[PDB]
């Protein structure tokens, strides 16, 4: 699968649920899994969002440092879903704060991080097909 396509479709879905149209089985599974993740932990995402202090100056370092912490002890499919949801939070905050250009940057950062830092783990653990298999019963 193309990680760029997965990121772009995921970001567009998350923004469209907020009423913002951003120009840009795996997709459906990730969408449902991220929605389920979000609804379980709204209190934590709200605190995360309030502390984000998103500006074009801080956005990249904020993303990089959070993702580094997220994978400090390794990777699992839950961490992958959280990676997408955290990127989604930054995208939603971007448009809410009239910094919509940052969405393109976040999509780039997510795509390149997947391809550089997560591709080996994903393939080693059966590819995106394994994620679809794992979460299928929850759909």
């Amino acid at each position: 699968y193309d990680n760029r396509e997965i990121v772009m479709k995921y970001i567009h879905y998350k923004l469209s649920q907020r009423g913002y149209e951003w120009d840009a089985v795996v997709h459906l599974t990730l969408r449902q899994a991220g929605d389920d993740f979000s609804r379980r932990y709204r209190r934590d995402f709200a605190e995360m969002s309030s502390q984000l202090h998103l500006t074009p100056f801080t956005a990249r370092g904020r993303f990089a440092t959070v993702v580094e912490e997220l994978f400090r002890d390794g990777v699992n499919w839950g961490r992958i879903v959280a990676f997408f949801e955290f990127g989604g939070v930054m995208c939603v905050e971007s448009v809410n704060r009239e910094m919509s250009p940052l969405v393109d940057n976040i999509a780039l950062w997510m795509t390149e991080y997947l391809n550089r830092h997560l591709h080996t783990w994903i393939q080693d653990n059966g590819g995106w097909d394994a994620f679809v298999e794992l979460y299928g019963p929850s759909m």
């Binding site: 995360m48 904020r62 912490e69 400090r72 839950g78 959280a82």
Partner: peptide, 21 residues
């Protein structure tokens, strides 16, 4: 340190989530 806190909670939530599959 903001990112350490965020990342720590995302890991906790991630691990709870995946362990419930």
């Amino acid at each position: 340190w903001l990112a350490q806190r965020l990342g720590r909670e995302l890991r906790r939530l991630s691990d709870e989530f995946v362990d419930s599959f």
